[PDB]
Design a protein around this nucleic acid. Sequence first.
RNA 1: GCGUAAAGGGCUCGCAGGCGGUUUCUUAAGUCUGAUGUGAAAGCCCCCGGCUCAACCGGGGAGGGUCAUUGGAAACUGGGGA
Lengths: 199, 131, 165, 224
Amino acid sequence: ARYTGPSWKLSRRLGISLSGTGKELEKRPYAPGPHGPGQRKKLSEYGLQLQEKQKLRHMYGVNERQFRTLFDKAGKLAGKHGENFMILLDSRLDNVVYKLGLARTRRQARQLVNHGHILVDGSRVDIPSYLVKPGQTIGVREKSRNLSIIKESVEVNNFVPEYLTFDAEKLEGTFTRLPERSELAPEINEALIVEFYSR
Amino acid sequence: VMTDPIADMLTRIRNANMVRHEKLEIPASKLKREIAEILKREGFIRDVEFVEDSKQGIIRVFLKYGQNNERVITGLKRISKPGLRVYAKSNEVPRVLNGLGIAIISTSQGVLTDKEARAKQAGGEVLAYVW
Amino acid sequence: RRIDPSKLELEERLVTVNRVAKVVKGGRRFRFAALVVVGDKNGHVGFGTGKAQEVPEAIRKAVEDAKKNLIEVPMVGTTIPHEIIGRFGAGNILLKPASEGTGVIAGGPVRAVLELAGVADILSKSLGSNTPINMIRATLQGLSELKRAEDVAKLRGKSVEELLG
Amino acid sequence: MKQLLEAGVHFGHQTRRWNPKMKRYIFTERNGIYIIDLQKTVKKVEEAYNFTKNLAAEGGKILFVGTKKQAQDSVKEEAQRSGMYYVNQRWLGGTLTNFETIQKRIKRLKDIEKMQENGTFDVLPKKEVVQLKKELERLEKFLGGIKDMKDLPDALFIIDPRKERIAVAEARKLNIPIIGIVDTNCDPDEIDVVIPANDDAIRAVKLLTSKMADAILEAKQGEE
RNA sequence: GCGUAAAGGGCUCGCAGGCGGUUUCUUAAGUCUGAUGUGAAAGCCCCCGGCUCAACCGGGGAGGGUCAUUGGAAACUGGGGA
């Protein structure tokens, strides 16, 4: 059950301020902790290993079991290693939910996706890690669509993905293909997931 | 003596292959002959001119490796040990080197090369391996 | 040859900064020794260093060692031409040619050297010695012996791109 | 373009101890030495003429390197009247390989030279001009010829394949070009322009340093 | 791997065994290849579908043998003759 962290110091010492995209601790850019204001140093190969695995895994927030099974399960696909892991670990039902302009928080859109509300493909999708392939109508679950969170997130703007496609009035959605695999260009470098989780 | 002829020729082209000698001798046999036409046709040495005479022998090849240290004979290995024989099926005919070298598997229709033997798609005794 | 000039951006990773002491009259005159290898990020990755009195001094003599030598390492796009077991100095290295997204799976001195010398997918697991200087020595000889396919067709006169796959 | 009849006064060197490398160009052995191969010396002399001229016209200094006794007249007169600044004395340790500390030796030669008319005498007592005049007296007689190389020596015309072995290693250090007349009992593959002839006859030294120094001299002033 | 780290038998003669000069005809015993049988299911891997997804299930494939029976090549080891 991932929903336990603070959500300030986890990004604050996790390596990069996301997400975001301003909630990175701009008041104190150092790492969080009692011995944290001082000079930071680099790690070993396990330093970039833990920063790559904890950094790229903290963007979604799953447990190490499901994230590991997405590591080898992502490596079971075709293409390249870090690209398949990158399109897999971000094409989830909650990343497709909060990436479609659904909710203004990754945990908030997560609980909006597994709260029974955001039912997609015409039916309900009640598991926050139960994704949808390219072409499923990632809907809004119109029996409770008149809400404050959905209307406010429909009022708040954001750069919608070109792998996906939104709907603010028709109450629908879609994912046109796999997302822009190298195109989705955060700081999460997939080589550290090819090294700090490969042994 | 005479443990294996092809290992004597391969040790000849190896030891002369590091000596920087112009020509190299050999014991003239059907393996030195067909291996001379294969290993000469693939472009390692300049020319084999099998100057035969009584009683047996005797091949005489020239090292076709220029100024640059280590020419087209850059390293050879006994891929087949006369004494514990190698084997290779059709799908398991391994191409030695990966992209640079070439192996010579003695196919059932002649002493082929690696890619040509895979072109026939039939393997045999792994005759030698020139990495 | 040829000795490549210091004409690029060097990486300057430190391999390991070992202690050293000459047992002289009075204890042991301790001097730091660090063999830290600088890398160009395209193929000029050379790894030698020296000794000096302070840790930054060993950084200075090591960087002078990186400005000493450089290697080529010809490899077409996340590989080497022929994955040869390259080790000289009683310490082996078994670096094969890997695929595109198979990562730079190497060890301490291999992961430093190839990790700072432009590697994309070259599987490497050693077999032999484990000194640092022996690792950079046999790894440097193995990287400095692996052949390139275009020049391998251009020096052994059969045909360029006649050996493909 | 070597004088073929004039080359018949500089073919001959040590014998009965010649290595396999520098003996491939040997003509034959008739009872005192191996007779060096004449036509190889001619065509190689042409390679030194054209390559030494055209590469010498790129603008870099030529290091007239010489070691042996009676090898200092051909290099001091040849380069000192040629255009290079060489060293015909006992060899300095790491000449090109140091490249800075030899420069600071150039600084001691600089203040020692310019201090002669710099009022160096008549400031301190007689021990100052006496000991210091001994200092340049024992500094200029060893390391003065490097003043004709302020940049690195772009080429090393080394005239001693055995006595100048640390020089051949020094130019082996950089990628510098080192052509030179290496004797019959020498190592062939160490140099890049072999002058396969002897060095025992001093007239062979005048023909070698005259063909080399005259080659770079005549090839260099032809710009105008 | 075996001069000095552990490791050359103190040394020889020899049976069994292991390996063997060059040319040429046959052979298929090995070597290699094609066709059939058989290697049950379930499982591993690939390709889809069903339990809200997943674990799971189901369907569609694959691969697994000094394997038999049988057709070829004779280059190499062997059988036989010169």
